[PDB]
């Protein structure tokens, strides 16, 4: 068998239900919390989000976060050199993927 | 009672049912797998497959494998000196013998 990493957003099989997780991640990446890191796109990371993911977190499967935060749809378009990005830690995104993968409910849902 | 070594092909009592195990061994010996060993027939091993079986594996009861791979029905027929042989490891042979002794089904059978 060939499993998937716990950091992959593909863990949610429906491309429409992944919109909640993507929205939450992007909303976090535009906020100003105290646990955020500031990273500039180096001249050699214009076409390679994998290199940025490896240099920032040490995990290479988080390239979808880097693609999402830059505002792109494909990896074939180059990012602008010198764009400021803010990235959250890996544990948060990992539990966020798990949340929508399992609970799926929206943050703030009222239950009895 | 005289116990038969666990590496003997006589472990299957029917000469017709042993044909499937022999076919599997011969099919493996002719493949191009990555954990086979290449052995050339030396001038003093022309009539003695037991010496080759002892020199390669360290077990003398594996002479039937050498006779099979070389392409002879009789042990008194001399092998061609310098013939290239490919021979598998011993644990694989033991596992195949156990499977065909205690289960006796074709490798690609479908069960429910």
């Amino acid at each position: 068998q060939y499993p998937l990493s716990r950091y992959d957003d593909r863990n949610i099989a429906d491309p429409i239900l992944r919109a909640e997780l993507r929205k939450e991640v992007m909303l976090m990446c535009e906020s100003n919390d105290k646990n955020l890191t500031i990273y500039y796109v180096l001249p050699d990371e214009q076409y390679r989000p994998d290199l940025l993911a490896y240099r920032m977190w040490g995990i290479a499967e988080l390239r979808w976060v880097v693609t999402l935060a830059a505002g792109l749809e494909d990896e074939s378009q180059g990012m602008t050199v010198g764009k400021k990005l803010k990235l959250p830690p890996a544990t948060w995104i990992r539990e966020m993927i798990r949340h929508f993968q399992y609970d799926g409910q929206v943050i703030g849902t009222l239950s009895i | 009672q005289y116990p038969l070594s666990r590496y003997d092909d006589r472990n299957i009592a029917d000469p017709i049912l042993r044909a499937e195990l022999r076919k599997e061994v011969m099919l493996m010996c002719e493949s191009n797998d990555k954990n086979l060993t290449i052995y050339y027939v030396l001038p003093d091993e022309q009539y003695r497959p037991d010496l080759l079986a002892y020199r390669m594996w360290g077990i003398a009861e594996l002479r039937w494998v050498v006779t099979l791979a070389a392409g002879l029905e009789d042990e008194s027929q001399g092998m061609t000196v310098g013939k290239k042989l490919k021979l598998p490891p011993a644990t694989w042979i033991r596992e195949m013998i156990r499977h065909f002794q205690y289960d006796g089904q074709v490798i690609g059978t479908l069960s429910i």
């Binding site: - | 017709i16 049912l17 006796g104 089904q105 479908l110 429910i112």
Partner: protein, 68 residues
């Protein structure tokens, strides 16, 4: 009569692709029917004696009995 099924997927074209049932299932057997499903369409494949008059498009198969 009771009905039970088993399925096998194809990874590549092996040019004969023999499929063998288990000993217990062959012990209790009355009929055999073969279906092939490709891009959402499924059809029966008829049997033939050897391959006597079919070629290059006919959907046929041949039954055989192993020594076991």
């Amino acid at each position: 009569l009771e009905i039970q099924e088993v399925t096998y997927t194809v990874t590549a074209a092996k040019e004969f692709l023999e499929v063998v049932l288990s000993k217990a299932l062959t012990a209790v057997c009355y009929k055999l029917e073969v279906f092939v499903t490709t891009d959402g369409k499924t059809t029966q494949w008829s049997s033939s004696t050897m391959f006597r008059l079919a070629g290059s498009k006919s959907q046929v198969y041949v039954e055989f009995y192993k020594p076991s």
